[PDB]
Amino acid sequence: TEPRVLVSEVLVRPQSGQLTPELETQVYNVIRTQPGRTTTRSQLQEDINAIFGTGFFSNVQASPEDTPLGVRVSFIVQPNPVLSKVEIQANPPSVLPQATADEIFRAQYGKILNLRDLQEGIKELTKRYQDQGYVLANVVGAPQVSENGVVTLQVAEGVVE
C-alpha cells in the first residue's frame, strides 16, 4: 500500500495576491492532511480535490518539503476572481434572450466567483432551454473564467423544427 510520511506543518498560501482569512479557513475546513499525522500521495490529491470542491479557487496544488521533523505541506491556492459577468456562447447566436445569462447569474455579480453557485445557475439555464423546447441542451466542457471575472459558458443548444 501507499507509503506514509509524518507531516510536521501545513501552510495554506495564496499563489499571488493575499489570502483572506475567510478563504484560508475554507481550505483548513476540507483538508485532512494535518500537522502531527501522516499523509500519503493520494490523501494529498484528495485534499486538493476537496479544496476545488469548495468552489472558491481556480488553481490548487500541494507542495511538500521534507525535513528531519516531518514534511511541511504547502497548499497553494489561487482564489477565483470577483464575478463580473456570465456570457453564453452558442455558436462555433443563442436561441435564448440576450439578457437570460444576467437574469440567472446577476445575484452572484460583484462577489468572488463560486463554482458551486455557478453550477446551480447552470442548472437553472438548462431548465430554461428545456422550457423553450430545447430539451437536449448541454454545456460544452467546463466554464471558462477570465482574470477579469467574465465567465463564458459554451452551450450546445440544439435545433428544433
Side-chain angles (χ1 to χ4, degrees), residues 81-89 94 97-115 117-123 125 129 139 142-146 148-155:
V82 180
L83 181 66
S84 58
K85 99 138 99 172
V86 178
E87 283 179 7
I88 293 166
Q89 174 189 78
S94 174
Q98 185 257 275
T100 140
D102 295 331
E103 321 192 334
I104 300 165
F105 292 102
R106 210 185 279 125
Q108 307 175 30
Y109 290 12
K111 275 180 296 170
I112 181 183
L113 171 62
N114 187 284
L115 299 161
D117 298 343
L118 190 73
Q119 198 64 41
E120 281 295 290
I122 288 166
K123 288 211 156 266
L125 220 207
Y129 280 108
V139 176
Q144 51 233 317
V145 190
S146 272
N148 341 49
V150 175
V151 179
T152 308
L153 304 175
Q154 202 158 76
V155 183

Side-chain angles (χ1 to χ4, degrees), residues 20-46:
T20 153
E22 288 77 20
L23 281 174
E24 203 191 327
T25 302
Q26 284 288 140
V27 173
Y28 277 112
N29 286 354
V30 300
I31 66 170
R32 281 182 89 196
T33 293
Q34 101 179 62
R37 302 294 180 263
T38 50
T39 198
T40 67
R41 191 206 67 74
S42 300
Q43 182 60 255
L44 289 177
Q45 186 54 46
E46 194 166 304

Side-chain angles (χ1 to χ4, degrees), residues 59-79:
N59 198 214
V60 182
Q61 52 185 276
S63 183
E65 189 193 63
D66 198 28
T67 81
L69 313 184
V71 189
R72 301 167 91 246
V73 175
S74 287
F75 290 103
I76 301 147
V77 305
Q78 184 44 243

Side-chain angles (χ1 to χ4, degrees), residues 96 121-134:
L96 289 179
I122 288 166
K123 288 211 156 266
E124 186 173 346
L125 220 207
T126 298
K127 180 54 163 61
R128 288 278 302 108
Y129 280 108
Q130 180 180 295
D131 288 339
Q132 299 312 307
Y134 297 83

